[PDB]
C-alpha cells in the first residue's frame, strides 16, 4: 500500500500549500469587493476540508478536489480580466494531475489534461479581456504572484514526490541487501543461482580429486555430565567460531558442523594442484589452536583428526532444508581414520603418505602413517 500512501501524502501537501498561497492573496486584496469574497471563502474552506475528509472511500475524493479547483478558478477568472493569470494555473495543473493520479487511471488522467486545454483555448477568447475591478495595480501584482506561485507549487510537489520515492528505494535496498548477505554467507554463490530458479533439477557435480579432514572431541559426554547444557553450547560456539576464523583465513571451505564433529573439504569449488598440502598445514594449525584454547572445566580439549583424499560428488539433496554436502569414498576413509585416531594426533592412509612425504613429515604406525608436522628445512 506504499503507492497509495505516496499519492495521499503528495495530495495532502499539495492541498496545504495551495491553501497557504490562497490565504496570502485574500489578505493582500484591498477594496476588491464582497462578491468575490463569498466565493473565496467557499474555495478555501473546501480546499482545507478535503485532506481531512480523504478517507471517505475510493478515488472520487481526489477527483472532487480537482473539480472544486476548476470551478473556483473558472469563476474567479471570468469576472476579472485575462491578464490576472488564470491561464497559468491550468497549465500547472495539467502536468500536475498525471503525477497525482496512479498509473491504473492514466487514460482518465489524460482526459483531465485535455479538459484543462479545452478551457485554455476558451479562456483567452470567451472571457472578457482586461476587465477592471477596482485597482488595476493590484491586478498586476496579482499576475506577478500568480507566476511565482505557479512555479513554486509544481517545484515543491515534484520534489516531495521524488524524495518519497528515493526514501522508499533506500529502505527497500537495505532490507534486500541484508538477506542477500546472509544467503551468500550460508551457501556458495554459484549454486545459489541454481537454487533460486523455479525449475528443479538434481544437482550432481563430479570432482576427480579432493581432500577431506574430520576433527572430533574426546570424552565430550564426561565433560557434559559436570556442566550445565547452556554453558556447554556456549563453549561449543566459541570453539567453532575460532575454528571458522582459521578456516576462512586459510581459504578452505567447511560444509557443516554436527555436534562435536568438524568437517573441512579442500578444492571442491575450485580444483588446485596443492590441495593436500594446504589441508595438512591447516590441520597442524588447527591442532595448535585447539591445544592452546581452554574449556570451562580447565582441562585441555584434545581433538582426533583424520585426513583422506580421493574423488568426490557434491550437490544438494532433498526437497527441503538444503545444504551443500559432499560424497565419496574419501568421506568413508576419513570417518574411519578419525574414529581410530589416537588422542592429540593426526592420522592419514598410505595413499596420502605417498603425496605428503615430499613436503611434510609423517612417521610411526589398512596401514596408516601419523602426520607429525612440516619439514623445518627450507
Amino acid at each position, epitope marked *: 500500500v506504499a503507492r497509495r500512501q505516496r499519492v495521499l501524502t503528495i495530495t495532502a501537501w499539495l492541498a496545504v500549500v495551495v491553501t497557504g498561497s490562497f490565504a496570502l492573496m485574500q489578505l493582500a486584496t484591498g477594496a476588491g469587493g464582497w462578491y468575490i469574497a463569498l466565493i473565496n471563502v467557499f474555495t478555501a474552506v473546501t480546499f482545507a476540508i478535503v485532506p481531512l475528509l480523504h478517507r471517505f472511500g475510493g478515488l472520487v475524493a481526489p477527483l472532487t478536489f480537482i473539480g472544486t479547483a476548476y470551478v473556483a478558478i473558472f469563476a474567479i477568472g471570468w469576472d476579472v480580466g485575462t491578464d490576472a493569470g488564470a491561464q497559468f494555473f491550468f497549465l500547472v495543473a495539467a502536468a500536475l494531475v498525471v503525477l497525482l493520479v496512479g498509473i491504473e487511471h492514466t487514460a482518465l488522467a489524460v482526459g483531465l489534461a485535455a479538459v484543462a486545454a479545452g478551457l485554455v483555448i476558451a479562456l483567452e477568447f470567451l472571457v472578457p479581456p482586461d476587465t477592471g475591478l477596482q485597482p488595476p495595480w493590484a491586478m498586476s501584482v496579482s499576475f506577478v504572484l500568480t507566476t511565482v506561485s505557479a512555479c513554486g507549487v509544481a517545484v515543491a510537489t515534484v520534489w516531495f514526490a521524488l524524495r518519497d520515492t528515493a526514501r522508499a528505494e533506500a529502505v527497500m535496498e537495505a532490507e534486500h541487501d541484508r538477506s542477500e548477505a546472509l544467503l551468500a554467507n550460508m551457501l556458495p554463490a554459484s549454486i545459489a543461482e541454481r537454487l533460486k530458479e523455479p525449475e528443479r533439477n538434481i544437482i550432481a557435480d563430479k570432482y576427480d580429486e579432493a581432500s577431506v579432514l574430520f576433527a572430533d572431541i574426546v570424552g565430550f559426554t564426561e565433560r557434559a555430565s559436570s556442566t550445565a547444557p547452556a554453558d556447554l553450547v556456549r563453549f561449543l560456539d566459541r570453539l567453532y567460531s575460532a575454528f571458522d576464523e582459521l578456516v576462512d583465513q*586459510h581459504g578452505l571451505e567447511k560444509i557443516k558442523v554436527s555436534g562435536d564433529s568438524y568437517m573441512v573439504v579442500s578444492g571442491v569449488p575450485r580444483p588446485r594442484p*596443492d590441495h593436500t598440502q594446504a589441508l595438512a598445514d591447516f590441520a597442524l594449525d588447527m591442532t*595448535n*589452536v585447539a591445544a*592452546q*584454547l581452554k574449556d570451562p572445566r580447565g582441562n585441555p580439549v584434545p581433538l582426533r583428526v583424520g585426513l583422506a583424499t580421493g574423488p568426490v560428488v557434491a550437490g544438494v539433496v532433498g526437497s527441503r532444508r538444503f545444504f551443500y554436502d559432499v560424497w565419496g569414498d574419501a568421506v568413508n576413509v576419513a570417518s574411519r581414520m578419525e574414529s581410530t585416531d589416537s588422542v592429540g594426533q593426526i592420522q592419514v592412509p598410505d595413499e596420502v603418505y605417498e603425496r605428503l612425504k615430499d613436503d611434510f613429515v609423517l612417521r610411526e604406525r589398512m596401514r596408516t602413517w601419523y602426520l607429525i608436522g*612440516r619439514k*623445518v628445512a*627450507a
Partner: nanobody
Amino acid sequence: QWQLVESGGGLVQAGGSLRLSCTASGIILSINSMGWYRQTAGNEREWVAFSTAGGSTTYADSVKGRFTISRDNAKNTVYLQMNSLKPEDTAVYYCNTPAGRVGGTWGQGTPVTVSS
C-alpha cells in the same frame, strides 16, 4: 622471549603507499603462518591479510588488490605492501600467528594515519 615487533607506520596522504614490517623472535617463520590485522576503534581487531606456510595468501574483501603480504624467511620477517590508501585504513596494525591471536598475547602494533 616470544615477541613480534611491527614497524614502518606513520603519516601519509590519501593514495600514498607504505610497507609495514613484522619481525618475530622465538619461532621459525617457515613453519608458522602469519596474519596482519588492523584496529580502528569502531570494532575489535579484524584480519586484513594472511600468509600460510607454503606461499598461499588471502586478503579481506575491503582490501583485496591494494595490500600485498610477503615473507622473508632469512630475516624472519613478514611485509605488508599498502597501496591506494584511503581514510578507512587509518588504524593500528598488528602481526601474529593464530595461536597468539586467540591467546591474546601481542606486541604494541604500528600506527598508520591517512590524511592531508
